[PDB]
Design a protein around this nucleic acid. Sequence first.
RNA 1: CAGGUCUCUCGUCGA
RNA 2: UUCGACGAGAGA
Length: 457
Amino acid sequence: GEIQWMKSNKETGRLNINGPTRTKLEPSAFYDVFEGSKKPAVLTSKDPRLEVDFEQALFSKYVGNTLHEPDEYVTQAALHYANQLKQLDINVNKMSMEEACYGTEYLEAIDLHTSAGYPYSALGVKKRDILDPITRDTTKMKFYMDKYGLDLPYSTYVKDELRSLDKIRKGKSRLIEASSLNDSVYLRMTFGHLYETFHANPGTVTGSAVGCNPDVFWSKLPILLPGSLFAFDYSGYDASLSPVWFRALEVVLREIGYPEEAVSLIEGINHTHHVYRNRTYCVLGGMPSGCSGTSIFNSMINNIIIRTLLIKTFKGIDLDELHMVAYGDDVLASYPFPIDCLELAKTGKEYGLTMTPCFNEVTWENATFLKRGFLPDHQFPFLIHPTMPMREIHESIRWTKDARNTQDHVRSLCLLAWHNGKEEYEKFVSTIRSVPIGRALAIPNYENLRRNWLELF
RNA sequence: CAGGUCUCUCGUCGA
RNA sequence: UUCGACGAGAGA
């Protein structure tokens, strides 16, 4: 992905989208008793902690484009993935606007607690001023889709969140491309049922982990991915995607029977306009993260990428012998034979992909997925714990958006940490008990946590 | 008053 | 066990 041009809003006529510059994160009741080095991200170029120029850092991720267009390897990869998807019988029909707006069983209603995007926010219209969970009315929605059309620009904002200390001085905050309500509605209408299918089917048919629950999914993976394991992460996945991957995504959607009217929306996300503050810019390539279907499309593309890199790098691959699941850029995969990932990553560079783990042999003992390790339980080794490092839980507990959430916050971290074992857990709970606010919390005991988890099977 | 698309899990109030 | 509204945490 590559920024094509960037121009004044006075020159493009776009209303300006200016978000808040101050963080909602503040030191928690446990800032003092736990060690950590993450801080809230830089949100303005004025930030004292900055050691670089902000806006060049913010946009440095768009590292250009390479292939615009499938070679035969991309093409066979896309069709193998698309053929796999056929067993799901995805309904390529349009969703009503009412379903796109207000939800179904496997499609959540549009989130009424977040911005309505360009132009509404600059105009002071909120989603809840257009959509209504009780009436379930869509005439106000249709009116505004008529008034402002489709293919509106994405409102860029900096994500308020913790980052590593390295990424503070280097202005390496992450961007949110807020979707306009109009585009959310239209991409939900045309792809709602695909979303429904992917949400109801985490696994190795969709090749997607969206909708999994690591507590029980981790024990399912060694069955789902038999044979030898490989994996990697990517440097700046969404911004590194060249248009060829969006043209492959269109082949896949075509093969499962979408009409061209639907398939060509994908070009409307491979080619995008964004409004950051007072200036407009335009990107070719690259997934706009806040867009509808972004996690699903990124995972589909990832299935295309892996297959493409398999058959271009080695002779005599049988794609039908590949198992994989992706969650965005995160990949876990298996093949009857060990796969040289250093070689794969190299091929990935020929397509603009910067892929990252030396190339250690991937084992269940060292693999990670969704930032969790894998650790067979001692009593029952056919049941696998998702392990989250204690450093990350320590970093989390030192901050708060509202002291009213301490119990929920600390409870949620307890359910993540215990998988690291009784010793590490009791040390965690004990530090929490070392401040008065810690002593007031309801904290489960490891044995209860372990028994509850054991009973899930 | 603002700051995306989502998943899971937990909690609070109901059925 | 299941379903709705709201809040939270982690992950993508």
